[PDB]
Structure formats: structure tokens, C-alpha cells
Amino acid sequence: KRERMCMKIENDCIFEVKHEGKVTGYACLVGDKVMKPAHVKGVIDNADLAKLAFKKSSKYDLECAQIPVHMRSDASKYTHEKPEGHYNWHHGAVQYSGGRFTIPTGAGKPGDSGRPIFDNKGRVVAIVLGGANEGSRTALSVVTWNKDMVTRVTPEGSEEW
Amino acid sequence: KRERMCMKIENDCIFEVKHEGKVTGYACLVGDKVMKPAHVKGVIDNADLAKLAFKKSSKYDLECAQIPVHMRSDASKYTHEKPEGHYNWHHGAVQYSGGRFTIPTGAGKPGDSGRPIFDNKGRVVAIVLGGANEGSRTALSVVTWNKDMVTRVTPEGSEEW
Q1: CB pair distance less than 8 Å for B46 and A20
Q2: CA atoms within 13 Å, Cβ hemisphere of A153
């Protein structure tokens, strides 16, 4: 059941990043802000977004932009609560343990940066920046939200996708 | 059987050429090199092939380039022998007689250049460049391979496609 509304919100809140005719990442709609990883380069496949003025920060590895008014109804809902346990993702399941997001499978690859992670109610909880291969698992270097503050977690050995 | 494998080899080994938004020709990937008819102008429907520095030959009327490493497993097979009989083509079957390739119907149209001619085992024998309407048939001005050289057959009255 969860995958259905998950994929609905995904297609309603994901636009791929083009560069040199090839996909490189994804910029997603959260709340009232278009947000994209900064390590990835290119242009988003929309005339409305391409002309937007972007605020960029390498310390957090992220660009943001104000979404147009007419597109304000096509964005997700955010949250800051971080209960321990299990969460969904475009390629399956993720686990929040010890303040750390983990992929059990290790199925991550370049070009998967910017794909948001969702909660039980479909609310976006994080965005994947990169992965770190720890044994059979992949610790996820992501940008997440506190109540008022934006934080970044990057475990050792991570690599930008 | 032969028709289906010819179609799949053509799908995996042909890239269209577009100019002013209209298709103008075809480029084919054989062995470890991409080649296109030189007379046809446009851009290949692949940024990977579009950025390669193509080598030109007006006398042979052919452009060639060395394929990238990651496309090397998607390459058709070549040969150099020309037994007498019939051969496969995207538009049917071609007849070989006395050094002449001919279409049974004369159904070739402008913009059809570059579509490879396959052997019984799917190996490429020649590359179609142009046609000449002789009688009720069309003679093929094509590009074939010797032991180590390239030869071009252009019967009189032929026109570039």
C-alpha cells in the first residue's frame, strides 16, 4: 500500500537533472522549496525551474530555490521527528539506528543522489547525498532537518553519487 | 528468426541522425568503431557519439570514430567475404550478382543511408550509401571491406540518400 502513494508523491515531487544529455541527479520539491545536491552539475528539465535563482552552499552540499506559486500544490510535506526504526525509499527499505541511516542491500549507485527518503505517512525525512560501504551495509551521508536547523551526516569512507 | 535478430541487431547498432528536427540518415556501430555516411549531415542521437572526434574521408564518403569503452559489448560482428546469393536488410532482402547489390523493388528512399547489410549469421557485409533506379530494380552504391582496405561501389545514375 505504502509504495503506491510513495511513487505518486515521487513522480509529483521529482525532476531529473540533465547534463551533457545524460541524467546525473534529481532535484525534489519539499514544502515550498526546490532542493538539489550541490556536487551534481547540470540543468533541471523545466523552463520554470531553469530560470530560478538558486541559493547554493557547499558546507551543506545543497542548493535551494523558491518554488513558483502555481506549483505550490504539487509538493510534499516535511517533518523533523526522527523515531528509530524503519523507513521507505525509492529502491526499497532504509533503517534509522543510532542516528544513522543505513541501506541493508548496498544497491546504491552514482546518479542516485537527490532521491528523498520518506516516513510512514509519506513525509520526506531526509535526502540521500552519498553512500559509504561498511561491510555488507551502506551508511547514508544525507542532509536532514532539525526543528529549525539543517544538518549533514557524512560517515567516513562515503562517496558522492 | 533471421528477421527478429536482424531487427534487434539494428536496434542495438543504429543511431538516428537528426537535422532541423528531421531524420536524415543512420550511423552504425561495428566491431570497435562507429561509422556514418559522410554526405549526410546532422547530429547523432547520442551525446557520447556526438562528442567523438570523427575522421572524415570524402573519397570514400565515410566518417568513422573509435567507440567508447562502455559501448564495446554492444557491437555487431563484421566479415569480409561476399558469397553469391541473398542477404538481409531492414527493408527486406537484397540480391548479390556479379559484384552488384540490387533491391528487388526499388523501395529505397532519401534518408535511408547507413543501414547495414547483414549476412546469414548476422555479420555485416556492406553499408548502403545510395541507390540507382535501373530498370525495375535499384543498384546499391555501397561500402564494403577487403582484406584490410575499404572499397566503394557507385554505379552510374546513383543518387545520395
Answers
A1: no
A2: 19
Q: How many Cβ atoms from other residues are within 10 Å of residue A120's Cβ?
A: 12
- Give 3-state DSSP helix, strand, coil % of chain A, rounded to 5: 15, 45, 40
Q: What number of CA atoms fall less than 13 Å from residue B113's CA on the CB side?
A: 29
Joined together, the cell numbers standing for residue A161 give: 553519487
Nearest CA in chain A to B46: A21
Q: Write down the experimental method used for this entry.
A: cryo-EM
Resolution of this PDB entry, in A? 3.0
Which residues is A58 bridged to in the sheet?
A: none
How deeply is A90 buried, as exposed, middle or buried, from its count of CB atoms within 10 A (0-12, 13-18, 19+)? middle
Which residue out of A19, A20, A23, A43 would a mutagenesis test of the B interface target, given it has the greatest number of B Cβ atoms within 10 Å?
A20
Kindly report the backbone phi and psi dihedral angles of residue A119, in degrees, each rounded to the nearest multiple of 5, phi listed first.
Answer: -90, -175
